[PDB]
mmCIF file of C-alpha atoms and ligand atoms in Angstrom:
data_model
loop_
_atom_site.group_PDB
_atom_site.id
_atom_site.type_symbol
_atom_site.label_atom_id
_atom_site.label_comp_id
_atom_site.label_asym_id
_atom_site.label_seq_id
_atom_site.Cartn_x
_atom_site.Cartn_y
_atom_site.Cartn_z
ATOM 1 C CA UNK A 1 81.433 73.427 122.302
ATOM 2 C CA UNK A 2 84.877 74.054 121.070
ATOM 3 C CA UNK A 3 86.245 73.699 117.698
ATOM 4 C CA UNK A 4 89.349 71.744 117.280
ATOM 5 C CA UNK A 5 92.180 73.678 116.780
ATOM 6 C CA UNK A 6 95.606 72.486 114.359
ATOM 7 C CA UNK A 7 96.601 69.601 116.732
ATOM 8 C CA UNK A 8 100.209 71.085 116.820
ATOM 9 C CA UNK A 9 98.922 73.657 118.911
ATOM 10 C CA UNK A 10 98.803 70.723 121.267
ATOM 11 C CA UNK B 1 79.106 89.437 130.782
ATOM 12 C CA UNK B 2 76.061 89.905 131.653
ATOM 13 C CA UNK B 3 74.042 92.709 129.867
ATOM 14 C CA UNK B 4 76.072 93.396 127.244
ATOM 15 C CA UNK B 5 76.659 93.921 123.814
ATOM 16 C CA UNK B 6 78.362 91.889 121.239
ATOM 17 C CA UNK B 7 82.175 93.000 120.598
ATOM 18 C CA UNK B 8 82.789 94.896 117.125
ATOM 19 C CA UNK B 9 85.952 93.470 114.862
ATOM 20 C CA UNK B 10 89.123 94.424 116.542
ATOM 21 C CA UNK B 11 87.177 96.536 118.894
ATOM 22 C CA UNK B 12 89.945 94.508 121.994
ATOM 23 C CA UNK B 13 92.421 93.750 119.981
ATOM 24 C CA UNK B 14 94.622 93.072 122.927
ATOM 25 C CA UNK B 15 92.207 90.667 124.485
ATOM 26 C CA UNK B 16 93.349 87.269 125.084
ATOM 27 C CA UNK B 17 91.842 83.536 125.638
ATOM 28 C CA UNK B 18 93.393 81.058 127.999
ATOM 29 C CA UNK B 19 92.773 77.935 126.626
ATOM 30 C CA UNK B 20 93.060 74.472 128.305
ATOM 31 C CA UNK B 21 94.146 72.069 125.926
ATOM 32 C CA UNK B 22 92.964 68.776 127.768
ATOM 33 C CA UNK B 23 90.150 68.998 127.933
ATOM 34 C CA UNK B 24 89.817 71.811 125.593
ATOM 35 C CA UNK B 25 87.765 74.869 127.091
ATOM 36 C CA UNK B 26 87.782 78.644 128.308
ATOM 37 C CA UNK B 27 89.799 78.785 131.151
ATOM 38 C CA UNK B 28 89.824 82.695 131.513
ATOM 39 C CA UNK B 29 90.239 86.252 129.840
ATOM 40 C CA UNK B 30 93.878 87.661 129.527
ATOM 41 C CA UNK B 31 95.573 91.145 127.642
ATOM 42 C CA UNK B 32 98.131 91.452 125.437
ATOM 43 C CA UNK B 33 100.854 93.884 126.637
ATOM 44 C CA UNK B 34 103.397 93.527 124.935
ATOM 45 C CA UNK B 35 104.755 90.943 121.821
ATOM 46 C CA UNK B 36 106.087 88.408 123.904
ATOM 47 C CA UNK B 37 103.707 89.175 127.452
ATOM 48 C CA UNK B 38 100.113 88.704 128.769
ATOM 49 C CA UNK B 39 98.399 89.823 132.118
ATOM 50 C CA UNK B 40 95.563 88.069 133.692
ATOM 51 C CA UNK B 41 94.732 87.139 137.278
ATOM 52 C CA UNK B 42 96.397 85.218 138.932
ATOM 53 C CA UNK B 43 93.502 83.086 140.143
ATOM 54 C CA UNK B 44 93.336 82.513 136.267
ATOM 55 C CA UNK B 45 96.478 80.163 137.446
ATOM 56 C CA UNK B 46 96.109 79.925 141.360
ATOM 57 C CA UNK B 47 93.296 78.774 143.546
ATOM 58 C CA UNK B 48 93.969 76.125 146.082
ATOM 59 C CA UNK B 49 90.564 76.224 146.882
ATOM 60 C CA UNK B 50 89.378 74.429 143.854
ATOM 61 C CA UNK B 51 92.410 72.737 143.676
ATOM 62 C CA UNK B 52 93.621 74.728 140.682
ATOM 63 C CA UNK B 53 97.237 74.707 139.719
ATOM 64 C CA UNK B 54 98.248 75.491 136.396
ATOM 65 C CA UNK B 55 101.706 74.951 134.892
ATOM 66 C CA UNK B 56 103.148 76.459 131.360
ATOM 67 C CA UNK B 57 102.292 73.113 129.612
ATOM 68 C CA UNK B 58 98.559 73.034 130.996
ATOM 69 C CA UNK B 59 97.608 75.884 128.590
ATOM 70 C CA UNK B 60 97.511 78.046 125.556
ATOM 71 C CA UNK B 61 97.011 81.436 124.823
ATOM 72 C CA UNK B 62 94.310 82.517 121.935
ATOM 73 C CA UNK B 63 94.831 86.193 120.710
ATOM 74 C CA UNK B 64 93.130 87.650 117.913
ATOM 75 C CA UNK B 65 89.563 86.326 118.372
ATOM 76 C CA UNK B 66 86.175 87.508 118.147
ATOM 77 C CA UNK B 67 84.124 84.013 118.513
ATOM 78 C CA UNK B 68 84.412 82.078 121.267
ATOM 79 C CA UNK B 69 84.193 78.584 120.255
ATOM 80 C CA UNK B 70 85.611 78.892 116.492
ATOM 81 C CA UNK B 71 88.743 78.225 115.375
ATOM 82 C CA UNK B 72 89.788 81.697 113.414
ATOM 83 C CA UNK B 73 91.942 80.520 110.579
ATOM 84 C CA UNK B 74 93.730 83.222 109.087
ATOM 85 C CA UNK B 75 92.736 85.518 112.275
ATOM 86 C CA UNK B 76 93.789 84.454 115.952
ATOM 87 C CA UNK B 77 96.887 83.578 116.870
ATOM 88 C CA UNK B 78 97.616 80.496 119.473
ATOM 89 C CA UNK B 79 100.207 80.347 121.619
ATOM 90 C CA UNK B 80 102.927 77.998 123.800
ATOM 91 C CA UNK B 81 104.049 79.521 127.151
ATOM 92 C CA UNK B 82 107.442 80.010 128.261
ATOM 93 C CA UNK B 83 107.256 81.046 131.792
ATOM 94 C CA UNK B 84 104.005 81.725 134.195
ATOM 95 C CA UNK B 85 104.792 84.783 136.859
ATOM 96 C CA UNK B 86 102.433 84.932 139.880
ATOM 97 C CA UNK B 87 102.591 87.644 142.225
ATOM 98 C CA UNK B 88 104.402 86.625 145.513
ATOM 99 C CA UNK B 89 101.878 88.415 147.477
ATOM 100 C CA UNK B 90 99.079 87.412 145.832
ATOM 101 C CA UNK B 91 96.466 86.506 148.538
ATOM 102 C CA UNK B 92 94.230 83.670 147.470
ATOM 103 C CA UNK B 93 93.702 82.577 151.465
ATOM 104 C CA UNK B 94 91.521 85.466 152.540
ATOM 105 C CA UNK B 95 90.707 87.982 149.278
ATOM 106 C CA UNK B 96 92.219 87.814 146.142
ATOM 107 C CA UNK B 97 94.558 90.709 146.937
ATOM 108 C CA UNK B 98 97.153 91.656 144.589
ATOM 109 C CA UNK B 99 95.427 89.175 141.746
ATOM 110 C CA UNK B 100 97.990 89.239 139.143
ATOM 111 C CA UNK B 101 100.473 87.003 137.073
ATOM 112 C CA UNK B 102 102.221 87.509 133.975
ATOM 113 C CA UNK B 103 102.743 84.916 130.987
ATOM 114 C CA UNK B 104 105.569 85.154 129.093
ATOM 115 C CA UNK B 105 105.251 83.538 125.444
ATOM 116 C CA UNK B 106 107.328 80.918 124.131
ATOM 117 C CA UNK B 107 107.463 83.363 120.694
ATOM 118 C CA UNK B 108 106.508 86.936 120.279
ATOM 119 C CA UNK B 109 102.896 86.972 118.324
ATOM 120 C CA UNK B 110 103.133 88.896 115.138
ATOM 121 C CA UNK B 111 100.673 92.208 115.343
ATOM 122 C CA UNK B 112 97.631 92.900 112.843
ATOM 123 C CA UNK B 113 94.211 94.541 112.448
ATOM 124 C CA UNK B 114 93.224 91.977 115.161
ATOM 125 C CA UNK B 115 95.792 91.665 117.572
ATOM 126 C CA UNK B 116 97.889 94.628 119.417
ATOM 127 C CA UNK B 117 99.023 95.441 122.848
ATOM 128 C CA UNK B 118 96.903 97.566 125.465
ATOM 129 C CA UNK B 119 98.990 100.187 127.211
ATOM 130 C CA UNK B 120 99.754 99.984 130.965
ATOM 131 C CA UNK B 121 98.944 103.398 133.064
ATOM 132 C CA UNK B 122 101.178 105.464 134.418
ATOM 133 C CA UNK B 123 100.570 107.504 138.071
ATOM 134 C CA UNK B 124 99.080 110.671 136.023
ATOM 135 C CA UNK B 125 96.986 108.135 133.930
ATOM 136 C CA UNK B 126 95.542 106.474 137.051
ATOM 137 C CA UNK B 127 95.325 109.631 139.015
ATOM 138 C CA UNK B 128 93.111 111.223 136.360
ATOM 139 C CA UNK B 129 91.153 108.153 135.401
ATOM 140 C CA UNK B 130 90.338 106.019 138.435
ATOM 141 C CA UNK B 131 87.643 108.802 139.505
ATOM 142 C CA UNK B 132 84.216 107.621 140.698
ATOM 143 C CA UNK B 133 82.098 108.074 137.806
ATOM 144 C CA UNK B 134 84.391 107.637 135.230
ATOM 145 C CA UNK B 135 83.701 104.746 133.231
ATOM 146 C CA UNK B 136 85.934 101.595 132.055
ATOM 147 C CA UNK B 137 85.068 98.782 129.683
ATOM 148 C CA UNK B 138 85.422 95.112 130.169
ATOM 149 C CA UNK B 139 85.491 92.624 127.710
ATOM 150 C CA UNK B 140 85.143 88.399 127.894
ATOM 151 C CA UNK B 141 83.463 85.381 126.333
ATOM 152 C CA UNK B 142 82.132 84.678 130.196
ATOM 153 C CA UNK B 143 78.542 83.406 130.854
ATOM 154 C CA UNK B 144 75.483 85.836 129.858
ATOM 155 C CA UNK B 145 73.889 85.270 133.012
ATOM 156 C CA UNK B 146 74.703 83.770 136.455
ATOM 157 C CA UNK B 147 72.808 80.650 136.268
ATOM 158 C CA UNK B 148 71.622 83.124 127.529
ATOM 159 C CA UNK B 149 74.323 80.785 128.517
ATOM 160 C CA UNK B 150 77.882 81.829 126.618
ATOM 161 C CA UNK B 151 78.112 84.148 124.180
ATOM 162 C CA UNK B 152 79.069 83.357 120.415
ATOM 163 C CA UNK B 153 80.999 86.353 120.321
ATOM 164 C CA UNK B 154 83.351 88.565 122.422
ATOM 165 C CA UNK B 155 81.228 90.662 124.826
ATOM 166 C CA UNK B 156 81.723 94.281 125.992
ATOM 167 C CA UNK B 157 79.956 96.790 128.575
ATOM 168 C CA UNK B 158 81.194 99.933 129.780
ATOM 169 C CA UNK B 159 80.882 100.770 133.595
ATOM 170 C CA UNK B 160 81.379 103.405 136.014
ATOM 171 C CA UNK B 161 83.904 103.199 138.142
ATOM 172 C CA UNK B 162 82.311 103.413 142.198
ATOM 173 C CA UNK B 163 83.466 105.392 145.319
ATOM 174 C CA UNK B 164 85.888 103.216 147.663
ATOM 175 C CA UNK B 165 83.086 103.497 150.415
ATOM 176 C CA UNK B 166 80.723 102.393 148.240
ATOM 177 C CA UNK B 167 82.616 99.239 147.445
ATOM 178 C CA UNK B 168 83.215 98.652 150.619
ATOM 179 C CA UNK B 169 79.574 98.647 152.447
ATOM 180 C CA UNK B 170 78.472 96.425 149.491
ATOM 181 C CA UNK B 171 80.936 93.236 150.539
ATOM 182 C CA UNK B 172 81.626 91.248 153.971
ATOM 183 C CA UNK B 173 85.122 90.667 151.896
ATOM 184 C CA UNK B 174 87.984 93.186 153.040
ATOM 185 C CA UNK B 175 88.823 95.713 150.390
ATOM 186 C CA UNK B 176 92.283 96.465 149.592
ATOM 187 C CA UNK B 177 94.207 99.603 147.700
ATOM 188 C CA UNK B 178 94.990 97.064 145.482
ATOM 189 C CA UNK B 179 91.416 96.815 144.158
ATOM 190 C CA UNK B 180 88.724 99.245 143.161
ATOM 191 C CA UNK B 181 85.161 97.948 142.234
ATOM 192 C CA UNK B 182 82.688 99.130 139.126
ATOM 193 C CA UNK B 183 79.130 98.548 138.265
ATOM 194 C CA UNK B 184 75.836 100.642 138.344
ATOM 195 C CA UNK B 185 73.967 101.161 141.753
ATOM 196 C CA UNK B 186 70.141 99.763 141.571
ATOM 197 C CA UNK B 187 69.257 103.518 141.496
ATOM 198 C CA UNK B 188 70.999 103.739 138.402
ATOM 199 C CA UNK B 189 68.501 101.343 136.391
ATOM 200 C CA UNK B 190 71.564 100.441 133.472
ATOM 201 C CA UNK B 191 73.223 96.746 134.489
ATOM 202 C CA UNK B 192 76.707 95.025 133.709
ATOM 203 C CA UNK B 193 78.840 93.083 134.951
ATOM 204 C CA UNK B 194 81.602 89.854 134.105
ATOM 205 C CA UNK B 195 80.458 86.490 134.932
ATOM 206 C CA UNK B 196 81.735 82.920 135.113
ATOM 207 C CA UNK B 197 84.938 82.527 132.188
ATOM 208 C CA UNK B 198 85.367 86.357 132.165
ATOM 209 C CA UNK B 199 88.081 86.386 135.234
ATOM 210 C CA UNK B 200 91.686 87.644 134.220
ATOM 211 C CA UNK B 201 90.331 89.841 131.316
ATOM 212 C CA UNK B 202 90.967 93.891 131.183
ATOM 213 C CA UNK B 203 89.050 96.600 132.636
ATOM 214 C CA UNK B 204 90.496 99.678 130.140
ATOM 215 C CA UNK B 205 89.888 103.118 129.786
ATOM 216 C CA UNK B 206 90.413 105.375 126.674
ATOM 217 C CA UNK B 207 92.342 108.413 128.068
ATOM 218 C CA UNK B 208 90.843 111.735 126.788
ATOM 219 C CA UNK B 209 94.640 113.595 126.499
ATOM 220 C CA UNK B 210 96.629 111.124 124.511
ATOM 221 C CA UNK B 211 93.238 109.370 122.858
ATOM 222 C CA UNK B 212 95.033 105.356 123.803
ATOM 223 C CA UNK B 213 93.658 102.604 125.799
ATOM 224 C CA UNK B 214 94.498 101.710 129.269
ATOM 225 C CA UNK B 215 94.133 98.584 130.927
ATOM 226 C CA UNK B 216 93.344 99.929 134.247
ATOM 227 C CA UNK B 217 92.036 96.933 135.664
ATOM 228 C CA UNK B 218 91.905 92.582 135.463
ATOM 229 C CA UNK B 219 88.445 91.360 136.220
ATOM 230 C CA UNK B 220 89.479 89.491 139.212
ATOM 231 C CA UNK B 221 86.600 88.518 141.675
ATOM 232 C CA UNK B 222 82.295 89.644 142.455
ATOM 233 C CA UNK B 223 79.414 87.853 144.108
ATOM 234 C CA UNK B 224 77.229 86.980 141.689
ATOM 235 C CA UNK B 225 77.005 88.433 138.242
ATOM 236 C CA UNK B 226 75.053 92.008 138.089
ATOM 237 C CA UNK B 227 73.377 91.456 141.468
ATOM 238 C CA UNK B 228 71.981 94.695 142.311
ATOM 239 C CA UNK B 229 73.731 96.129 145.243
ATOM 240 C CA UNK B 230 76.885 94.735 144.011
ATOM 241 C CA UNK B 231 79.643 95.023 142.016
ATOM 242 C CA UNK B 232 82.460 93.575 140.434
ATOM 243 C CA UNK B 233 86.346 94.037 141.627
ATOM 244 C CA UNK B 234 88.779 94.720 139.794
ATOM 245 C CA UNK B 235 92.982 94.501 140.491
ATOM 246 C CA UNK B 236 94.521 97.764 140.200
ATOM 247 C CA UNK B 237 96.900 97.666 137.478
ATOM 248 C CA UNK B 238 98.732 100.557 138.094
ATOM 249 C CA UNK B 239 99.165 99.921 141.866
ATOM 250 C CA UNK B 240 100.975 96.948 140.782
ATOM 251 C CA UNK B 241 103.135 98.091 137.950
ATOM 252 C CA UNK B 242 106.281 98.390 140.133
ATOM 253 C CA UNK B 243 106.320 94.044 140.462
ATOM 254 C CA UNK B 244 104.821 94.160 136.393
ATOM 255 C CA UNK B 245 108.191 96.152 135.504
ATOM 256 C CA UNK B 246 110.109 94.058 137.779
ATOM 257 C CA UNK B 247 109.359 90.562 136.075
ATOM 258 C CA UNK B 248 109.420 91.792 132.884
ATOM 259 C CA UNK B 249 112.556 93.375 133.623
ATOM 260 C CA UNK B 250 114.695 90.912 134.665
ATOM 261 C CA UNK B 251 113.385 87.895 132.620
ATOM 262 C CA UNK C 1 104.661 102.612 121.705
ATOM 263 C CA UNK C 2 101.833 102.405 119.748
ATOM 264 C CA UNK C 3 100.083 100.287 122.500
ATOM 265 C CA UNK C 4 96.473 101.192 122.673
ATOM 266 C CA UNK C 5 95.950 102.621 119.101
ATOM 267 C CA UNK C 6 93.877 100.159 117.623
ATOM 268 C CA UNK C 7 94.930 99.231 113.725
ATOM 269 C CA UNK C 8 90.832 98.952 112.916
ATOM 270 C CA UNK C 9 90.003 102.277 115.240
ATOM 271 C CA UNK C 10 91.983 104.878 116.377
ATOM 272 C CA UNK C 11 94.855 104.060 113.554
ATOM 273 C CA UNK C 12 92.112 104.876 111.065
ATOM 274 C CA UNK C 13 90.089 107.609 113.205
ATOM 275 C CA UNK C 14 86.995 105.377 113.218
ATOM 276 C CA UNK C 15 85.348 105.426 116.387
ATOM 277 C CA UNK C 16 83.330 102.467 117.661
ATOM 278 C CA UNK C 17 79.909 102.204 118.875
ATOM 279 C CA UNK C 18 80.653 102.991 122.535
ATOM 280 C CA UNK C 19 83.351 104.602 123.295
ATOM 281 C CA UNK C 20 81.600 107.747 123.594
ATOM 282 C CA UNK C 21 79.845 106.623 126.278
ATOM 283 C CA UNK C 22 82.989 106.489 128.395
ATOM 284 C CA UNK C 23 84.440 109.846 127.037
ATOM 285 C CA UNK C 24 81.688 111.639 127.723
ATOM 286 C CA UNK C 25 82.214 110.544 131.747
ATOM 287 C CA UNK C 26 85.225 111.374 131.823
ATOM 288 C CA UNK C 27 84.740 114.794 133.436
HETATM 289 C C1 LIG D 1 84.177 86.685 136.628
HETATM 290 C C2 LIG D 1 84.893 86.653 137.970
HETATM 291 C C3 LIG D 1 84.567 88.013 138.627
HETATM 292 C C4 LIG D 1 84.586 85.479 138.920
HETATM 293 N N1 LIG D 1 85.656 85.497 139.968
HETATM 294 C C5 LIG D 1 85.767 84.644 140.909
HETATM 295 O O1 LIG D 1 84.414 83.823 141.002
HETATM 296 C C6 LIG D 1 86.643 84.624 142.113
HETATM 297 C C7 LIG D 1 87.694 83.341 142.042
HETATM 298 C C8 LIG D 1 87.549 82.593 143.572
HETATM 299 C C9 LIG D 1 86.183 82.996 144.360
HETATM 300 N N2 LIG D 1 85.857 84.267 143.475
HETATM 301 C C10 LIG D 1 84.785 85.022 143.724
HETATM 302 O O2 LIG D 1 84.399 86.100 142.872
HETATM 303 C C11 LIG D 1 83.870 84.931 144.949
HETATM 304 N N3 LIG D 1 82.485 85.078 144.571
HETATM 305 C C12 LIG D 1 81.414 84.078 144.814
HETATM 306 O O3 LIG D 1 81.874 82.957 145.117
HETATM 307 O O4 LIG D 1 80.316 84.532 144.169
HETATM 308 C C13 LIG D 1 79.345 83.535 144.306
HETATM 309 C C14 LIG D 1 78.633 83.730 145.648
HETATM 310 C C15 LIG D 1 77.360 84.297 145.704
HETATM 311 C C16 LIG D 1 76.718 84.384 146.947
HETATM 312 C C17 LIG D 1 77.342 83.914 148.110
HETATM 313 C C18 LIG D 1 78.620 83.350 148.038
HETATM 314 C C19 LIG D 1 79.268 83.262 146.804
HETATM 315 C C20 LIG D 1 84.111 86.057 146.013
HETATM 316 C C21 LIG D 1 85.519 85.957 146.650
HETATM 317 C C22 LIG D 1 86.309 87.124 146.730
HETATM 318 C C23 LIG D 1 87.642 87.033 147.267
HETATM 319 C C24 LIG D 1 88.171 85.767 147.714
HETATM 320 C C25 LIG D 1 87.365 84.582 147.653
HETATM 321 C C26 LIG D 1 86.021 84.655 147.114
HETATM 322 C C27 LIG D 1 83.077 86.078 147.149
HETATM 323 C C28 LIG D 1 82.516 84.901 147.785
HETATM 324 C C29 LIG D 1 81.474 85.003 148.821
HETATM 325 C C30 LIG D 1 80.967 86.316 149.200
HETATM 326 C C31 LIG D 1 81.549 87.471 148.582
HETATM 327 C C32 LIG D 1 82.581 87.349 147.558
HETATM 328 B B1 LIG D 1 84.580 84.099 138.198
HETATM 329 O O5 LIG D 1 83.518 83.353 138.665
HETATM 330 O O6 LIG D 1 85.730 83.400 138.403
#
């Protein structure tokens, strides 16, 4: 249910 | 939480979200204590049980937020870790005793309306505080029930803290000075408790002399979610503030 | 320092919706 967060977080 | 209320802006603003980046979920509640330190549980981290082993590179930590599954532009904060810190005592084979690690972040957050560090309790602080009747508050974006679902929002509830007998003739589990449980009796009609996601978030008190917030407890284990003739446990913070000081100490 | 003095709360003397509750059991 999670919204994607700045993939550079990850 | 069960029976709670939805959390006003920066009401917690030390709360914290673990966050597992793959795939991408709640994995528990956590406090800010510092710029560059978080406390949660360490079964947050630790459970061989469930074959649960965490490293530094498994996670993130989310600080600043209010909803659970948005991304807060502008708002939260998300963070690498550096270095995970479990208690070497820390019992997962038999009760949970001494359930606490520290995270130590990669770089220290920057502070605002919506993120800022919890203080941790001295003797006099837990001496006059950690009195049956007295009551904490514990926050989390855990499940609304046992079995709504999960919140949309950070959750709060405020409950009294219950005599050590008490606690104790209400579990099979073996209660240690380095827990204390909270919760209503059935007698008392008024429910609460954390549930399923909110593990490793705070239990804190607002002291009365110096008017600051204390993070007394970390939501660490229950049976059930607001059974009656339960109640949650909590790790006592203060009881382990010696190893706390120690870690953050030396590294 | 200025751990547990909340920027939106206590920083401004606003009190939330709650804490009351827990102040008034502390007796
Ligand atoms: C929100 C927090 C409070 C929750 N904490 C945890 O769930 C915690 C991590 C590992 C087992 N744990 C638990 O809270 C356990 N609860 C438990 O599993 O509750 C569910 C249950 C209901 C009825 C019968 C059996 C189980 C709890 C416990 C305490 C200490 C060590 C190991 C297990 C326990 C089990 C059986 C009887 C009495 C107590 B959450 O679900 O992670």
């Amino acid at each position: 249910d999670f919204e994607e967060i700045p993939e550079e977080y990850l | 939480i069960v029976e709670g209320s939805d959390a006003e802006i920066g009401m917690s603003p030390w709360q914290v979200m673990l966050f597992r980046k793959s795939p991408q979920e709640l994995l528990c509640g956590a406090s800010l204590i510092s710029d560059r330190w978080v406390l949660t549980a360490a079964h947050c981290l630790l459970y061989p049980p469930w074959d649960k082993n965490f490293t530094e590179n498994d996670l993130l930590v989310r600080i600043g937020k209010h909803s659970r599954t948005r991304y807060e532009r502008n708002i939260e904060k998300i963070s690498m870790l550096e270095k995970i810190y479990i208690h070497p005592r820390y019992n997962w084979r038999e009760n949970l005793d001494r359930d606490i690690a520290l995270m130590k972040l990669k770089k220290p957050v920057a502070f605002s309306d919506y993120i800022h560090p919890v203080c941790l309790p001295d003797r006099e602080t837990a001496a006059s505080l950690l009195q049956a009747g007295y009551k904490g508050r514990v926050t989390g974006w855990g499940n609304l029930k046992e079995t709504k679902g999960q919140p949309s929002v950070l959750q709060v509830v405020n409950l009294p803290i219950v005599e050590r007998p008490v606690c104790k003739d209400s579990t099979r589990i073996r209660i240690t000075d380095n827990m204390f449980c909270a919760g209503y009796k059935p007698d008392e009609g008024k429910r609460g408790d954390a549930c399923e996601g909110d593990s490793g978030g705070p239990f804190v008190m607002k002291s009365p002399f110096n008017n600051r917030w204390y993070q007394m407890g970390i939501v660490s284990w229950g049976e059930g979610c607001d059974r009656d003739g339960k109640y949650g446990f909590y790790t006592h913070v203060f009881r382990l503030k010696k190893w706390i000081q120690k870690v953050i100490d030396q590294f | 320092a200025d751990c547990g003095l909340r920027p939106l709360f206590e920083k401004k003397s606003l009190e939330d919706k709650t804490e009351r509750e827990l102040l008034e059991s502390y007796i």
